[PDB]
Amino acid sequence: ERVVINVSGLRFETQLKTLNQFPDTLLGNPQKRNRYYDPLRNEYFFDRNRPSFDAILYFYQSGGRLRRPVAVPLDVFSEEIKFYELGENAFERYREDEGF
Known part of the structure; x- marks a missing residue:
């Protein structure tokens, strides 16, 4: 199925x-992403x-490669x-990578 x-x-x-x-992310968990399902357009809206x-x-x-785009502010990303609940394991690799 195409999403x-x-x-x-x-x-x-x-x-x-x-x-x-x-499966332990917002998009990887049907119960969580379905809260954002748009019945009218058959797509998920954010x-x-x-x-x-x-x-x-x-x-x-990428299999877990979390890289913030250079143009997107640290606080925004x-x-x-x-919000997308990517996990602590990834949130760590992210902090070390950014500095904090």
Whole structure:
């Protein structure tokens, strides 16, 4: 199944398997992502920061590689990874990488 994730108008597509390899995340848990399902357009809608989602999706496609885009502020991205509940293990690699 093809999944469409609409972030403030910017649509991303990926395989259901891709998101499910990380079941303890918002997008990897049907019970959590379904709270954002748009019945009208058959897609998941997130009224959030667009430039950050690129790094969020690549996290899944890369197997866990969490890299903040150079153009996205540290405080913004941190909020995003937190909202998508990427996990402590990844939030650590992220902190060491950023400095704190």
